[PDB]
Amino acid sequence: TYRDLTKALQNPLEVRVLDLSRQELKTLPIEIGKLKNLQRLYLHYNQLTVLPQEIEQLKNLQLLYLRSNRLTTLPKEIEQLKNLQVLDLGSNQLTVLPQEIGQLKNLQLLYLHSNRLTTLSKDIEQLQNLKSLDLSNNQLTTLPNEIEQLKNLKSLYLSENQFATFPKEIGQLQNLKVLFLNNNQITILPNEIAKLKKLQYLYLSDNQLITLPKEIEQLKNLQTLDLSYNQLMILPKEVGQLENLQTLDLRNNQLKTLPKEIEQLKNLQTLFLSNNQLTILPQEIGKLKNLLWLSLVYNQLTTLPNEIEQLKNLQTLYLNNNQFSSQEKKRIRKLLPKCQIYFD
C-alpha cells in the first residue's frame, strides 16, 4: 500500500495499492501507467475532471475508487480494465456512462451515488457479474429495458431520483434482496414488486404512496418494510401476510385504522405509527407476540383495547400527543406493568 506517487514511480513493479486521496489532484499524471501490477487505485477527494488514456496500462486493476472528484465521463480505455470488479464513481458530475461500461465483464459493484445521470446506459445488460448497483441521488425518471437482463443483481439503490412512476423493469430482477427507492415521487406500488421472492428489505420512505397492491402478500422473505413519510390512508389486509416482517415503519402517513389481519405478523418486533390519524386500534394488536417497540405518538387515540395486556414482550410504548384522559392513562399503565410507557 503506497500513498505517495513520486515514491511509487521509483519502484514501479512493486506497487499493488495506491492511495492518492486528498492530494488536490487536478489531473492523474500519465506516468501512472508504469505501475503494471496495480490492483486497487484510490483517488478519492481530489479535483479530477477526466481520467487519462494511460489507465489502459493497468491490466491487473481490480478496484477503482474515485469518490468525490469532478468527473463528467469515463475514457474509452476503461474497456481494457478486464479484471475490474469494483468501480466507484460516487460524488462526481457524470451526465452519462460511456458504452465501454458494458465491457467491464468482471464488475460486481458499480457505485454511482450522487451524480448527474438522466438515464441509465442500455449497455448495463452486459454486466452479468454485477451484484450491487447504486444509482441514488441522480435525475433518473425511468430504467432501460436492458436492466431486465441483470438476473444476478442482489442490491439496487434508486433513492433521491425523479421517479414519479415505479419502473416495471424491477419486476424482472428475480434475485433482488435489497431495494431502496426512498425520496422519489411514486404514487402507486404496482404488482411487479410481488415478483421479487427473495426481497428482504424494501425502502419506500418519502414518496406519495396512497395504495399498496394486494400482491404484497407474496413477499414472504420481506423482513423490513419502510413506508414512512407517504400518503397512506388505508393499509390493505394483505400486509398481514408478510410472515417474515420484523420491522414495519408506517410513521408520517394518514392511517385511520389498522386491519385485524396485523395479528398474522408473528415476527414483527418494531412498529412505528407516529403521526397518523389513528382513532382506534383493533383488539388483534394484542396478538403481536414478538412486538418489542411500538410508537403511536401524535394520533387521535382515546383508548386502547384490553388485549394490549397480551403484549408480554412489549418493552417500549410511546403514546404522547393523543386524546387520552387521565383515567385512560391510569388504566393503560395497569394493563402493561412490564412496559416502559410514555404519555407526556
Position 168 contacts Zn ion (CB under 5 A):
no
Closest CA to 179 of 162, 202, 146: 202
Q: Which three cell numbers stand for residue 32?
A: 501512472
Instruction: Give the whole-angstrom CA distance, residue 112 versus residue 200.
Output: 23
Q: Does 122 bind Zn ion (CB under 5 A)?
A: yes
Q: Of the candidates 69, 92, 108, 136, which one interacts with Cl ion according to CB under 5 A?
A: 136
Residue numbers 39-58 binding Zn ion by CB under 5 A: 56
284 counts as binding Zn ion under rule CB under 5 A: no
For 43-98, the DSSP string reads: --SS------GGGGG-TT--EEE--SS------GGGGG-TT--EEE--SS--S---
Q: Using CB under 5 A, which residues numbered 173 to 192 contact Zn ion?
A: none
User: Of Zn ion, Cl ion, none, which one does residue 103 interact with (CB within 5 to 8 Å by kind)?
Assistant: none
Which one of Zn ion, Cl ion, none is in contact with 272 (Cβ closer than 5 to 8 A by kind)?
Answer: Cl ion
From the list 49-57, 179-187, 190-198, 328-336, the region that binds Cl ion by CB under 5 A is 179-187
Structural contact between residues 181 and 163, judged by C-beta atoms closer than 8 angstroms: yes
The answer to the question of residue 274 lying near Cl ion (CB under 5 A) is yes
Residue nearest to Zn ion (CB): 113
Does position 68 bind Zn ion by CB under 5 A? Answer: no
Alpha carbon 287 to its chain centroid, in Å, reads 30
Structure-derived torsion over alpha carbons of residues 214, 215, 221, 227, reported in degrees to the nearest 10: -50
Burial of 28 (0-12, 13-18, 19+ CB in 10 A): buried
Span of 104-112, 205-213, 267-275, 306-314 interacting with Cl ion by CB under 5 A: 267-275
Supply 8's cell numbers. 511509487
Q: Across-strand partners of 225?
A: 202, 248
Closer of 103 and 182 to Cl ion (Cβ): 182
8 A C-beta contact, residue 153 and residue 127: no
What amino acid occupies position 35? L
Tell me if 164 sits within 8 A of 187, measured CB to CB: yes
Q: How far is the CB of 133 from Cl ion (least distance, A)?
A: 10
One residue of 136, 182, 230, 322 binding Zn ion per CB under 5 A: 136
* Annotated binding-site residue? 146: yes
Q: Which residue has the cell 408478510?
A: 242
Rounded CA-CA distance 182/170 in Å is 15
CA distance 57 to 139: 33
Of residues 203-262, those binding Cl ion (CB under 5 A): 251
Q: How far is the CB of 206 from Cl ion (least distance, A)?
A: 11
Nearest-Å Rg of the Cα atoms of the chain is 25
Interaction of residue 299 with Cl ion, rule CB under 5 A: no
Stretch that binds Zn ion, among 37-45, 112-120, 209-217, 304-312 (CB under 5 A): 112-120
Interface with Zn ion, residue 145, by CB under 5 A: yes
Cβ contacts of residue 326 below 8 Å, gap of 6+?
none
Judged by CB, which is closer to Zn ion: 71, or 296? Answer: 71
Which one among 2, 65, 111, 157 touches Cl ion, defined by CB under 5 A? 157
Residue 111's binding partner among Zn ion, Cl ion, none (Cβ under 5 to 8 angstroms by kind) is none
44 is in an annotated binding site: no
- Cβ 69 vs Cβ 48: under 8 Å: yes
Pick the closest to residue 246 from 211, 271, 274 (CA basis). 271
77 is an annotated ligand-binding site residue: no
Q: Which of 20, 113, 212, 241 binds Zn ion (CB under 5 A)?
A: 113
Measure the CA–CA gap between 190 and 209, rounded to whole angstroms. Answer: 11
- As given in the structure block, the three cell numbers for residue 343 are 404519555
Q: Is 111 in the site for Cl ion (CB under 5 A)?
A: no
Stretches 142-150, 238-246, 258-266, 283-291: which one binds Zn ion (CB under 5 A)?
142-150
The residues binding Cl ion (CB under 5 A) are 136, 157, 159, 180, 251, 272, 274, 295
Please give the annotated binding residues for Zn(2+), written as ranges.
Answer: 56, 113, 122, 134, 145-146, 160
The residues binding Zn ion (CB under 5 A) are 56, 113, 122, 134, 136-137, 144-145, 157
